[model samples]
Target: RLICINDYEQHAKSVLPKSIYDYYRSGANDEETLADNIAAFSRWKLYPRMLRNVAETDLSTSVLGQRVSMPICVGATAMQRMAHVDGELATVRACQSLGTGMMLSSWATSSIEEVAEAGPEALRWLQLYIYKDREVTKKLVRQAEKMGYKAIFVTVDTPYLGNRLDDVRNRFKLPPQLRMKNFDSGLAAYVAKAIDPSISWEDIKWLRRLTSLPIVAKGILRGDDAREAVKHGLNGILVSNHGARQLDGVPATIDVLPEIVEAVEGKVEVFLDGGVRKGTDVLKALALGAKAVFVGRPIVWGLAFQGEKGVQDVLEILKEEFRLAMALSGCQNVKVIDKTLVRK
Candidate 1:
């Protein structure tokens, strides 16, 4: 039998060492937003229609002009190898097989160049953190552009790492034995020194000049911020609460989607993250005007259970469930899924 999101979580607990599982699963403070991310999705119920000649459906969509088999993109999470030995290499293969896009984190165990070489045809985006040092940030951007990454997703939520109590309690540290091979010879030390505690919109402007690739500002949830992001000429705005791992009591990503959509109006593409597990969840996001949806911890759980195959199975299950959601909602294509498909 295929695993559900909860099943994946259980599998992760079983396969991963205790400290590792806590690092991946636990969130900041009381973990209110962490729980809310999943809980808030239940607030909206799907209104299904019957007998509409629903023999076939289409889940195809495009992001940044690159066509994908589905609108579900593999959201970025750092230090994948912690969950499994295969890490980014396993995920690259899974995304390629599923015909979807994969966002690789700057903190990934596999270097961007290695991932690109491993699966050159896979639609790839580089996720960046604005280092405290301008030179270090510039170096990463230049490297990503040279390596042929399709876009730059600059994560703005994490000015400093969240207070993950699990890691603190466990005295958790990424095993010293493991090394970030790609950064070792290059800019690792410089990048480490640069993670400035204070970053602002001026940094965004500085990053824009570093490369011609599309820049997406992640971790935005409010209407005012979304409007400002577009005004700053951002190519896309990804609404996420860092999987509710950053803040404890914030509203779920789903609850805040419409306001952000309204704020952006049509100037830029908007996507969503946090607590996405089922196909219905994905459909609900698209219905609210998200161009695409991204998933985080579930992918890590998939990797934990069965490496690459596990990840592939998780994606397939989600795709199948999403197709069913479309048929039930009277959606023929991704564009057709709208607010009408839900019951207030």
Candidate 2:
């Protein structure tokens, strides 16, 4: 039985055919950030409180105005059907079971409407990528709001695709059966070849004009950028290194979070999405000022192992582990975990 997210990853190694697996697992340039993102957690230690209520721990928290049972969300992953047959259907259902959130990828093999049609009841958001044509980008934002998507998690870091050598080695492309359904029938091809790099803070104003959905700026690391996101009126900021799939030398998301949080200083909701593997890791991020955690690959690992069932299993494992971390750390709730509970 798959006991942890790592176990699902190991199983996926053999379950998935080799080429696609590399596309899912590979990182940018030297992969230093990819390795360090997970390793950075080891540098800190959790300080257990000796006398406090440890019997009943509540992991509930409100993120972007949505109350969840825990501080975890399924971060957006491209091409879900690449790993499982059910695609977003399986993933979102698992999120529903856990009472968390799901960020649907723009490149998802399943379309936005299909996922929403056969999807989950969890708090759902869309991850956006602006193309060379502003109209293509505008249409998606409008559609997401029309279809009940709660927010737009615009990825600012990816002006273009990173040089993932594994994709080069394997000649990565869809298996001829699926395609990203978010784009209009003809625009998909044109958009993929045309990533817009010139989009700036001014686009934020355009986005505000186009839709009323809450806007979340993903791919922020610097304190100044975090402050800018707040100043520009974003509803949330996700501290991410694009899963180390964009830049190789950026500091691990966990290492730079305190600075971003300190900069934001409660101006907006600050979230994290890298280097989290265990419940203690979740606790550490929360202590350091992350409103919640967003996990990407682990959910893909679960999908590769057993589709929806495997994903649910992965979430339950983490949920129990987090609850245990809460009880053991001498806190009865997520709010009780603060800077004092951990030592850097």
Candidate 3:
């Protein structure tokens, strides 16, 4: 049976080996947060009006001062090559074709340079995982800046890797022959160096001083942390639970949006990720207060099914859906979407 673009996850499970699917799907602990992430969207219902002229709709929006054709962007996840041989290259190609940016994981199968070389015109951002060695973390930031990445997204939620049961059950390690091509040189030696597990506010301060590129802090939920992020001069805040891949019982990203928005006010740009599976869901997030949102598992689904083309189709599906949602909501542009469009 052919997989409809909307059923990307279902098709992905069939095409990929069970081990790989589970690795992408499983979350920390009992997966309470994973369940909640999808449930949080149910709290609000859209109130659409039928009288407005909806001849044309525009889904374009600006994020971190970069204009994107659509509000959806590719969220960073590790080891794309495991899903397909082309890996990060396939993802970068899709993002380039769609006129949007992608946040490439620090542990990507391809190096920052390789992906940059493939799509030098693409608006790419680097997602940084702070290591125990301050020097290694600093080196990664400098490398990304030199490559012309528009932003450095510092992932603060993962103090240590999540307790993913699938990796434990399968005794899964990257096959010995498979290599993270980007880290082959001095980066290889740095990876060998143990990363310090402890990260604190001071680390954020130190990271701020290392480069001039805009700093986007991901993995924020609490109002206080949002306040601190603004206080520290963060240019953007990605309200994420690491797709419920980390910490199990936390509230979903959508549930925390109002507080985070109120806390930060206009000091920084705010976006969201986690359980964003529908066009209506995207509209809901914009209604609440998100500048844009990101998708995780769906990108993997696209990669596994048809390589880069599948990835491109996934984005096109969302763009089409967003356009439809805007028409139904009677909003001609993304900027006018607000809380009044939805009700509890």
Candidate 4:
């Protein structure tokens, strides 16, 4: 009966406690952008052409010059242990098995050392939130560099947690049994604490010198900002609205992809992470010039459903659907999936 990710999502609702499910799915204030994200994809229809071989479809692509089996990876959705006992360990293993990448949250249930040890070959990136203590963030960057992480996703949109109404109503608190393995006790208490909002362009310059890992400026929705990131020599830009978790009423990420792509002009790798669910959505993103896509909430559903296997199923379903979409759309590989495939 669980034929797709949506089915897994509904199944997870039944299996998980209300608070946990809400934490995974809820967005900021009115959640208009959140709803718009998935809905935006429906507004644009894929123009599939007939008379193609439909047999030789390729989904492989590269980021920062390394090969990945597919163009979609898991985004950094924090507090995974609440969804499943295995938490990030299960999720990263699933990404590894699927031949994709996983972005580990700063608030991850598993520590940096443990995740690296758990999957020595896992393609993982680190999502960093600059805390008040400058050394804390520096320490994490150095650690990520040591762990062989492929990149560093600096989350700039969240200087403070958004007004998550669901968390407020649920009185969200980390279950006492779990801890944010990435940070020490006091620094990890970002729940009620104020994060360092003073992050500026200079910090990025400092960060570029702080470590050798590729730096990706996440949470970008503007063309000028995208251009700025490229000029600064940042390795990439991840188009996101923080899953609509940080700021409400911003345009859906897909809607803004074209603008950012136009601005960056392929100088930096562009990836998107909001409201991607279907293979057609993945195809559309590639057509709009995204190097790849990242998915978040669905991973929680997968984790809640059947641990590692469930997550794998979700990824495989998306990959298969993308493959079919390519064949039907008269494209053989990612390069052919250009702007001509979509209109308006």
**What's the TM-score of each model vs. the native?**
0.95, 0.96, 0.94, 0.97
Best by lDDT: 4
Residue 43 miss distance in model 1 (angstroms): 0.6
| Superposed Cα deviation of residue 103, candidate 1 (Å) | 0.6
Clash count for each candidate, listed in order shown: 2, 0, 2, 0
Each model's C-alpha lDDT? Answer: 0.84, 0.85, 0.85, 0.87
User: Which 10 successive residues of model 1 have the least lDDT summed?
Assistant: 183-192
Q: Which residue pairs does candidate 1 place in steric collision?
A: 132-194, 132-196
Off by over 4 Å in 2: 184-192
Candidate 2 clash pair list: none
Alpha carbon lDDT at 62, candidate 1: 92
lDDT by residue (1-344, candidate 4, tens digit) is 78888999999999998978887898898889989999999887777777877678888999777789999999998889898899899998998898899899988999988888877787889999877788988889889889888899999898767787877788777788998887722322464374777888888888888887889999999999998888777999999999998889999899999999999987899999899888999999999999999999989899999889889999999998899889989988887887878876
Candidate 2 lDDT (Cα, 0 to 1): 0.85
Candidate 2 lDDT for residue 142: 77
Better of 2 and 4 by lDDT: 4
- The window of 10 residues in a row where model 2 has the poorest summed lDDT is 183-192
Please give the distance, in angstroms, between residue 313's alpha carbon in candidate 2 and its true position after superposition. Answer: 0.9
TM-score, prediction 4 = 0.97
Q: lDDT tens string, model 3, 79-178?
A: 8998888999999999999998999998788899999988798889999988886677787888898888999999988766667666667655565556
Candidate that beats the other on lDDT, 1 or 4, i.e. the better one: 4
What digit string (tens of lDDT, one per residue) describes model 1 on residues 1-344? 45577888887888788988987898887899999888888888888767766677989999887899998999998888888888998998899999999999887888878888876888889899877666766877787788777899999887666677777777766776565544521222333465665788887877776788889999998999888888777899999999887767888999999999999888888999999999999998998889999999989999998889988988988998899889987788887787877754
Residue-wise lDDT of candidate 2 within 44-72, one digit each (tens)?
Answer: 88889877868778889998888999998
